[PDB]
Each structure stands twice: as structure tokens, then as C-alpha cells.
Write a protein that binds this ligand. Structure first.
Ligand SMILES: CC(=O)Cc1c2c(=O)[nH]c(=O)nc-2n(C[C@H](O)[C@H](O)[C@H](O)COP(=O)(O)O[C@@H](C)C(=O)N[C@@H](CCC(=O)N[C@@H](CCC(=O)O)C(=O)O)C(=O)O)c2cc(O)ccc12
Ligand SMILES: CC(=O)Cc1c2c(=O)[nH]c(=O)nc-2n(C[C@H](O)[C@H](O)[C@H](O)COP(=O)(O)O[C@@H](C)C(=O)N[C@@H](CCC(=O)N[C@@H](CCC(=O)O)C(=O)O)C(=O)O)c2cc(O)ccc12
Ligand SMILES: [Cl-]
Ligand SMILES: [Cl-]
Ligand SMILES: [Cl-]
Ligand SMILES: [Cl-]
Ligand SMILES: [K+]
Ligand SMILES: [K+]
Lengths: 330, 330
């Protein structure tokens, strides 16, 4: 599996047009792909945004030339109807052949609760996510209308009239052992986040491959993608503090509990310890340290990086990759 | 009220990239705005598409320079969550200041049923549409999180972190007398379709203005927009037959009954009489006839045209407007 280096352009940390400009610059510097978060409420309250990802993606695909672009990730089970998610990405891939993907996952209360008032348990959301993926695949792959009455979703003589030449690649998010195994069973590739290399090497990747083998798949053709935030600045302290915005992602309960007010998510983010940030995220003072940070995750099994630029000087955070990319391979 | 002439680029009759190219050409020829249908299933089965409109709009706004672009129309009550519709258009308007609008309406079974299995009555859907508009406005206009428990929709400490400089203009569709009055009460402007000038002059516009006055609004600042399909070709018979794809829109029951299979919608479309098509749509052999067709609708009260090009020669159907636009005024 070849190493791909992608850029995560946040619609929570930056205004959407600013994120679009970052994506264009990332492509020029040499990133292979661009990834974007799909949120309704942000992980932090102060100076935050939460732009709609699908509308932004149409603009980004049109503004760029060749990079692959995918969400990271799109929860297809509550505020979004899975058939509509299937239609959206099939449409974009027909418009921009070979440049479009989608990633899915069980959700976060901060996006789903504010607009539905509901929050089911983790096993129920995982179950809903598997059924959503089934719905998406039926629509992407069927040559005739399909009727389906699942436990959560319904299709009634549904057909996708707009399909791409080849199927949209589907990344499935798994953070815990059960989620990772489900990703191997139902996704084309793994997507993960907020894990230290040890967890990846010993739990996440092994469980993902176990799920793939149980389903009769060759895990060797399945990418291991991961969202990791980085901050690079000559002043180490300034670089580490600049990652504060994303500290809440390192609090496991934020992915399970019914917490959806960004002000309270921010309180938790502000309680995260500096060593937790340095252990999970990439804090670097120069290109050499960034290369080594990436290499420790490569050694753990990651081969498609989705790197979220949370650097004090955003443009430098992108530019410095002219030195990083060739050294890590792509 | 000044007359504006817009172009309706269909994602049902054309592939999405083809519709994008038409939009770019329309802007160059002089159209003031571009409108796009928001469907899951198409009005006709043969050679049809149904691309997702929001993703397409991000691409079209990025590819064009100044035209105003809006959906025509987006049903915000079942397959789409109204808070998400509110987020999508607020995001696009923040990215493309002053160039984005949205139109809403009660829906069509062909879009909502295939992905939900449900189809409420007209009065219930109208009621849901009014509550959806309330949800959208609360989110667009509030400076603090809002909590709302309506009959159909829920907001729980919801806040739009990404807002444009000024509010998204909202077109409200009304076809029947009650819908037209609701449009005057709750929309910023009227959107309508499938009506002859007499109906417009005597029922639709009067009811819309009645609704606006009841709500305390000045109807004089509210546009009267309408989607009308046209076909222009030197051979009149060829021009009229080219409108077949859209004949189903002239069958009132298609907006009320639970009919969602495009093959059966097509059967009905194929039973529509030629005089019905000539009376409601614009069939012309040259620029002069197009100008007179537009003038008869202007006289009935329409001042923002959304013209759907269903001409045999699509490019000529756009180009000929270099001669039409200056004569009808914009
Ligand atoms: C920027 C960002 O938010 C990340 C991006 C997301 C986004 O933009 N939008 C969005 O909606 N979601 C995003 N996600 C997260 C994703 O939606 C979803 O939350 C995760 O895929 C969930 O992973 P999972 O299915 O593995 O479930 C988690 C919660 C898990 O841990 N499950 C385990 C079972 C529960 C458990 O952990 N409890 C244990 C105790 C643990 C303890 O002691 O603390 C117990 O029961 O014993 C399990 O085993 O599966 C993502 C996601 C990725 O990957 C990348 C970008 C975004
Ligand atoms: C290309 C296209 O489909 C048009 C575009 C639409 C789109 O792209 N997507 C979409 O989801 N919808 C589109 N619509 C239609 C819109 O969603 C919606 O169907 C209309 O706004 C509904 O109008 P309305 O609220 O006025 O309701 C109609 C059905 C109406 O007639 N209501 C009346 C009451 C019922 C009635 O007619 N029955 C009468 C008997 C009549 C008889 O004898 O036949 C009775 O009860 O006595 C009423 O009074 O309100 C649109 C819409 C527009 O405007 C533009 C583009 C699209
Ligand atoms: Cl910004
Ligand atoms: Cl970021
Ligand atoms: Cl086409
Ligand atoms: Cl058309
Ligand atoms: K393709
Ligand atoms: K604006």
C-alpha cells in the first residue's frame, strides 16, 4: 500500500472561503487529496464556524485540478438521509470522475442532537450506520429501482438516475475495537482518528483486518486512513497551544455522551492536558520533526494521512510541506 | 418592480456537468440569474438524470462570476431536514456574497416517497412547509442558540456559526390559492409554476398579495417569480415536441397524489394534449415570438422569469437570448 498525504481543510476552524483557498494551495504544494469535516456544530465555541460540507465540496472540486476530495466524515443516519448522501456523492463523482470519495461514521451528538433532539446509544448508532451503508451501496450498485424496508431506513422503488462511471470509494470510521471491525466488514477502507500509534498497531488495525477477513475481503487492498491534526512553528509552545481548538477530540466521552453545546465541549477541551495533545497530535518546530512525526504513524500502519493544519501561521503550515512530502513518499 | 430574466438549468433533463456549462453560457449571454431544480426522481424516465442540487450549486457559483443562483425549488420537509437546508444556503451565501437564494415548496411525491415511504396530504405538507420556514428563519436571524419544539421539527440549542453578511432571500412556492396566500405571508417573494396568464392575473397574484397584506408586508417589494419552460426552433412542430419531457408538470394530480415512479409519471406526461403545452409553455420559432411569449406573462404580473431551456438545439436555445433579453428589459 503506497503512502498518500492529504490535507484536511476545516470548515469549523476556518471560514469556508478561507478553507477553499487552503485547499487550492495544498494542491499546489503537492498534497494528494483534500478532506473536509461535515459538521452542524463545532468542536470549540470561540471564533468557530460550521460550514456545510457538500456545498463546499462542489466549489472545491471545481476550483482545483486533480486532488481527490472526500468528507471526513459524513454521519449518514439522522440529520442526513442516507439515500440523499448516496445521491450527493454519486453526483459529484459523475461531475469530477475519479476525484470523489465519502467517509461515514456513527456520529457526534454536537451535530445530530441540535436538529433532531435525539441521541441513541453507541451500538444502536453503529447498527444504523451499517444499515445506511447498505442503503448507499444498493443505490450506487443497482440497475433497477430498489425497495427496502430496514429497521431505520426505507427505500420505495428508489433509483439513482445520476451515477458516476465507477463506484464512489467508501471510507468507514472505526475508533473503538467493534467500530474498527465493522469498518473492515462494510467499508472499502478504514478511517480513524484520535488514537496513539500503539492503539493503532495493537487494536485498531488488527480489528479492522479481522473484520475484513470475516467478510471475505483482501485487507491488503484496503487503505488505513487517519485524521491527525498538526501544528508547526519555530516556537514549540506557540505550536502546541495552537492545537487547543481540537483538544476535545481527545476526550472519548465526547463521542458517546449527549453533549452538543460547543461552550460545554470547549470547557472539556480546555481541561485536556498538554502531554495528551503532544502524544496524539503532531506538534513540530520544523520540517524534520514533522517527517519523524509522520513516520511514527506510518510505522503503526497508517498509509493515507488526512492532516489538519492547526498551525499559528496557516500559510507556513501548508508551505512547509514542500519539504515534508517528498521525504515521507508522495 | 424591475423585470429580471433568469435561466433554469435542469439537473433532470441534462447531466450535471452539461447543466453547469449551460449556466456559464447563460451568464455570458446576459441572463440575470440561474435557477436549478432540486429532485431525487425525475419528471420523465427516458434519458433522465436527477443530480443533487446543493453540491451542483457550489460548483456553479464557483464557475460563474456574478449571476444570482437559487434552487427552484427545495422541499425542506421530509427527505431534507430544514435546519440543514438553512445551513447549506447560509454557507453558500457567506462564500458568494449577494449571489445566493433559496426557494421552498410543499414537495412532490416523486422526490419524497422513494426515500421515506411517506406522503402526507396537501394541507399537512403546507403546514410542515410553514414550520420549516420558521425554523430556517430562526436559525438565520438568531444571535443566540434557539430551542424549538414544533409539531414536526425540533431545534435543541441550535446555532448557525456560519452566517452570510445579509440574510438569504427566500422564495416561497404557491400554485393553488391557499399556497399562494401562504407564500405572501411567509416568503420574501413568490415562486410559481404551471399556470396560464389568466390564472396568474386573477387568482395566484391576488392571493399572494392578500397573504402579504394580512401579514403586514408591502407586496410592492416582493417579486413574482415563475418557472416556465421554453423551446425555440425554426421548425414549430419540432419545438413543441421537445417540451414532452416536462408535460407531466401540467397534470395537477402529479403534485397531490402518491405517484413516484418516473415510468408512471411519464405515462401521464405522454397523455398531455398539445394545446395544453402551447398554452402554458413558451413554444417559439424565432426571437420575436419569444419576446411576445414573455410579454404576455409580464402583463399577467411575472417579473422574475426562470426560463427552462428544453429546445431541440440547446446551445441555440441559449444564444438566441442575446436578441430576446434587451427587448424584454434586462
Ligand atoms: C472533525 C471531526 O469531528 C472528525 C470527523 C467527524 C466529522 O467531521 N463529523 C462527524 O459527524 N463525525 C466525525 N467523526 C466521528 C464519527 O462520526 C464517529 O463518532 C466515530 O466513527 C465513532 O467510532 P466508533 O464507531 O468506533 O465508536 C466509538 C464511540 C467507540 O469507542 N466505540 C466502541 C464502543 C464504545 C466504547 O468506546 N465504550 C467502551 C469503554 C471505553 C472507555 O473506557 O472509555 C465500552 O463500552 O467498554 C467500540 O468498541 O466500537 C470522525 C471519525 C473519524 O474516524 C475521522 C474524522 C471524523
Ligand atoms: C421542476 C419542478 O419539479 C418544479 C420545482 C420543484 C422541484 O424542483 N422540486 C420539488 O420538490 N418541488 C418543486 N416544485 C413544486 C413544490 O414543491 C410544490 O409541489 C408546490 O409548491 C405546491 O403548491 P401548493 O402548495 O400551492 O399546492 C398545490 C398542490 C395546490 O394546488 N394546492 C391547493 C390545494 C389543493 C388543490 O389543488 N386541490 C383543489 C382541487 C383542484 C382540482 O380541481 O384539481 C381542492 O382542494 O379543491 C391550494 O389551494 O393551495 C416547484 C414549484 C414552483 O413554484 C417552481 C418550481 C418547482
Ligand atoms: Cl478563516
Ligand atoms: Cl484544521
Ligand atoms: Cl446532458
Ligand atoms: Cl430545462
Ligand atoms: K469515476
Ligand atoms: K450577502
Amino acid at each position: 500500500m503506497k503512502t498518500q498525504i492529504g490535507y484536511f481543510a476545516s470548515l469549523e476552524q476556518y471560514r469556508p472561503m478561507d478553507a477553499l483557498e487552503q485547499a487550492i494551495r495544498a494542491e499546489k504544494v503537492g498534497f494528494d487529496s483534500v478532506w473536509v469535516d461535515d459538521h452542524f456544530h463545532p468542536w470549540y465555541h470561540d471564533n468557530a464556524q460550521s460550514a456545510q460540507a457538500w456545498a463546499w465540496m462542489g466549489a472545491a472540486l471545481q476550483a482545483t485540478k486533480k486532488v481527490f476530495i472526500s468528507t471526513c466524515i459524513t454521519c449518514p443516519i439522522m440529520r442526513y438521509n442516507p439515500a440523499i448522501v448516496a445521491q450527493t456523492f454519486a453526483t459529484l463523482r459523475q461531475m469530477y470522475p475519479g476525484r470523489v470519495g465519502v467517509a461515514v461514521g456513527a456520529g457526534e451528538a454536537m451535530n445530530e442532537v441540535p436538529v433532531t433532539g435525539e441521541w441513541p446509544s453507541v451500538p444502536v448508532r453503529q447498527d444504523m450506520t451499517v444499515e445506511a451503508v447498505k442503503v448507499m451501496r444498493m443505490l450506487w450498485e443497482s440497475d433497477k429501482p430498489v425497495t427496502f424496508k430496514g429497521d431505520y431506513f426505507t427505500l420505495d422503488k428508489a433509483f439513482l438516475y445520476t451515477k458516476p462511471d465507477d463506484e464512489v470509494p467508501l471510507y468507514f470510521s472505526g475508533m473503538g475495537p467493534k467500530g474498527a471491525k465493522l469498518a473492515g466488514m462494510y467499508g472499502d477502507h478504514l478511517m480513524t482518528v484520535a488514537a496513539a500509534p500503539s492503539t493503532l498497531k495493537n487494536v485498531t488495525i488488527p480489528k479492522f483486518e479481522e473484520g475484513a477477513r470475516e467478510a471475505g475481503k483482501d485487507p491488503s487492498k484496503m487503505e488505513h486512513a487517519m485524521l491527525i491534526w498538526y501544528s508547526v512553528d519555530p516556537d514549540y509552545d506557540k505550536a502546541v497551544e495552537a492545537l487547543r481548538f481540537w483538544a476535545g477530540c481527545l476526550v472519548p466521552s465526547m463521542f458517546k455522551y449527549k453533549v452538543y453545546d460547543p461552550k460545554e465541549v470547549q470547557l472539556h477541551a480546555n481541561l485536556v492536558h498538554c502531554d495528551t495533545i503532544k502524544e496524539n497530535y503532531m506538534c513540530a518546530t520544523d520540517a524534520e520533526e514533522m517527517i519523524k512525526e509522520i513516520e511514527r504513524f506510518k510505522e503503526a500502519g497508517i498509509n493515507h494521512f488526512c492532516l489538519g493544519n492547526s498551525s499559528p501561521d496557516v500559510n507556513f503550515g501548508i508551505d512547509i510541506f514542500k519539504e515534508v512530502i517528498p521525504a515521507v513518499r508522495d
